[PDB]
Amino acid sequence: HMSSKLVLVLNCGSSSLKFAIIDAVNGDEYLSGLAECFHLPEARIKWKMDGSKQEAALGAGAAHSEALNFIVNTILAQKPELSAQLTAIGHRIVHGGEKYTSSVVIDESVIQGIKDSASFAPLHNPAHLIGIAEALKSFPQLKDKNVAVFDTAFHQTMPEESYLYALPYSLYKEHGVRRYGAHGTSHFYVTQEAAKMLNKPVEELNIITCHLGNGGSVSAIRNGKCVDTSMGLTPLEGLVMGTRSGDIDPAIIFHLHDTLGMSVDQINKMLTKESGLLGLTEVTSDCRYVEDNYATKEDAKRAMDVYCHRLAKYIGSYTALMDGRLDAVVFTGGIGENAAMVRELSLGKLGVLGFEVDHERNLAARFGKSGFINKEGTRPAVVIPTNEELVIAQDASRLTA
Amino acid sequence: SKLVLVLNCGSSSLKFAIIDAVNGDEYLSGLAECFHLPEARIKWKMDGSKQEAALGAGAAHSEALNFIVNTILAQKPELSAQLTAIGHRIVHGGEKYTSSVVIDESVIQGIKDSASFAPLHNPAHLIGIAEALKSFPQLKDKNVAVFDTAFHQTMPEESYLYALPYSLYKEHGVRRYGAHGTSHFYVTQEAAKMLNKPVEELNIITCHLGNGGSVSAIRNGKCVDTSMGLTPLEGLVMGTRSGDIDPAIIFHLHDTLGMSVDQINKMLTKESGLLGLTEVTSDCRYVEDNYATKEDAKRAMDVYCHRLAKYIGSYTALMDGRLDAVVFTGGIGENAAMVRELSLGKLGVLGFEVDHERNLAARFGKSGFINKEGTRPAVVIPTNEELVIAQDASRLTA
């Protein structure tokens, strides 16, 4: 009566490949790893399987081909019973444009769809296609069982009110300039879980979801559907992030260019690689540093306060999307699951809404534990660990198997 | 009777008024636009009925203020001796100026230094000051500068810093400064009067909607956050200004659509906002009148109200547990009933419920509470920035 449906989850960048084998039915992880430092002498691949840690090098100047070669011919070859059990392959895509509102099975037209959306993700989307092309060559058996899962799909339920910028409308009509967001897969996941935790249908769910980790985004959920999100055309907009600025006076770009002599490419690299938490603390991108030192160091305090200021205002701003009812706020992601004070300090600014954190409960909801962190009688607040890998596995399985 | 000459100088236009700083009585109005052009003309309304004349062809501030002395104040010489001070509107006071000040050489120097932030407006204000001191010799020690950025200087670093490299603030003063400060200040003081409580205990969110749009968060009578930033571009949807955008849109337009920095800069400030949304006009009156019958107006109304409603919502994070009222002011804010209603209608979670009958009454220079009786207060207060200039000018020279 019981069954397993193992799916290979792949997350391909231009110099990285995050891979995992998940049983879509129950969520069991059979393998996970990371092949990094592509086209360099350092080129290595790390993995936890049974699960203990193994590290090997693929060779100086290694590409995605040998990255899947090592998985097939070295890792999967030892456990052939595991290899045969594979029923599908899921691919994460950063940007799916307006064409893709949900996960889809990969064919020639999807390859083109990803290629056409590449305009919005010029660095990430091309790398997905390389990984997609290698998965078809390394796994011939699963060539009609490849599925694409879009970071943006979940945000396509947004009404025009939310996706349109106050720019020339022609810019949308003929160039697709629109709010698309990201972390859609995570935003979806925590919504489904919040239903379990609030003991109510996902269809009746009015929550504000905060994915804070590798990038940061807040989303406004109305009746289970996303009606607004913090990231925009690109992942640059919204929250204070590890290395990204988020919201700025757009005119700053012009002030950096015309007054400070910085090139478009210089400014682009600053807002993307040199801003955010690295910008505020002239030290590091790591939120763990700020979480620990904000009580003792000035640079850490200024970073924390700006961060939490930004987060609190976004939660507060999405009351405009709630149509009179807010069931709970949700925290998730590397930071959202682990950083207690970030949750305490940012929600503490929202007393008007009815938010106040319990310290004892807040600390308890860390390092994988899920829980309600709100003080009793106050508006619900949940820590729910995310699982983007699982969503890709579930979707890849449902549409293929 | 404390009479003040209020001056608002720009690149090609000098806007002027004589206001009584005791009771707000206007004794004169004016506008000397089209400088350095054949269209050089004046439009001076007065206690005695209005008229329009022509300054000349290729005119400057020196001629404008002299025309006020030799012609405008020639017919009415009773109020010339009545002048006690002069008030200058300054766009950017930088970090230096937290309140209005008496103009000496260090203030001139201060406005020069700030001119990095308002390169078009601040040098022009200086020419205005220059001519005001020579055209009105009697009042050379009685010129007062009122700054659009002054009121927001009570902002903590939590609000005024962008998540950029900290050196950009340290070395270059890159910071949130805002605007409409003289308006946000005024309506704050008035809200206290209407809410029958002290300004020092006043927690409100203020919305100046008109020539540009700005929302401010006030805690205990002090501004703690504002929607506009380094420049007036950031924040709300405005006439031609985009407000908040994904910063990357600029890089996309530049790198993908081949647009120049100048071309994107023009678009964002002159081709966007309501003009961008409705491919028709920047005029908000179009949006107010047609949002129920025309698609383009509806599109623009919804997006406008969405941005405003979110901003008001976002500033609950600054209220520290208590929000007394939301305030609407400015050309748009005082008169656009449905703009007020549609945006506050999105904030039901917060307890906002617009009373339509009250909403319609509070229009055209009329103040009033537009909220339903048991619900969270929402007030319309007509701003008076010229009076605040007159008051500051008069109070600091008595």
Numbering used by the authors:
A (entry chain A): 0 to 400
B (entry chain B): 3 to 400
Give the authors' words:
Acetate kinase catalyzes reversible transfer of a γ-phosphate from ATP to acetate in the presence of a divalent metal ion. In the present study, we report the biochemical characterization and structures of S. typhimurium AckA (StAckA, NCBI accession: NP_461279.1, residues: 400, molecular mass: 43.3 kDa) in two crystal forms at 2.70 Å (apo, Form-I) and 1.90 Å (citrate-bound, Form-II) resolutions. StAckA protomer consists of two domains with characteristic βββαβαβα topology of ASKHA superfamily of proteins. A cleft between the two domains forms the active site pocket of StAckA.
Structure of Form-I StAckA determined in the present study represents the first report of an unliganded as well as mesophilic AckA. The asymmetric unit (ASU) of Form-I StAckA crystal consists of four nearly identical protomers, as indicated by the low root mean square deviations (rmsd) of corresponding Cα atoms (0.43-0.84 Å for >350 target pairs). The four subunits of StAckA present in the ASU are further organized as two dimers resembling the dimeric structure of the archeal enzymes. The subunits of a dimer are related by nearly perfect non-crystallographic two-fold symmetries. The accessible surface area (ASA) of an StAckA monomer was found to be 17,920 Å2 and upon dimerization approximately 3,061 Å2 (17% of total ASA) per subunit gets buried. A total of approximately 81 residues (20% of total surface residues), of which 23% are polar, 53% are non-polar and 24% are charged, contribute to the interactions at the interface leading to approximately 23 hydrogen bonds and 8 salt bridges. There are also a few water-mediated hydrogen bonds between the two subunits of the dimer. This analysis indicates a stable dimeric interface. The analysis revealed conformations of StAckA that were similar to both the open (Cα rmsd: 1.15 Å) and closed (Cα rmsd: 1.23 Å) states of MtAckA subunits, and in conjunction with fluorescence studies, suggests that StAckA is also compatible with the inter-domain movements as observed in MtAckA. It is possible that the structure of Form-I StAckA protomer represents an intermediate state in which the active site is accessible to the solvent and ligands. Intriguingly, examination of Form-I StAckA as well as other structurally known members of acetokinase family revealed a similar cavity at the dimeric interface.
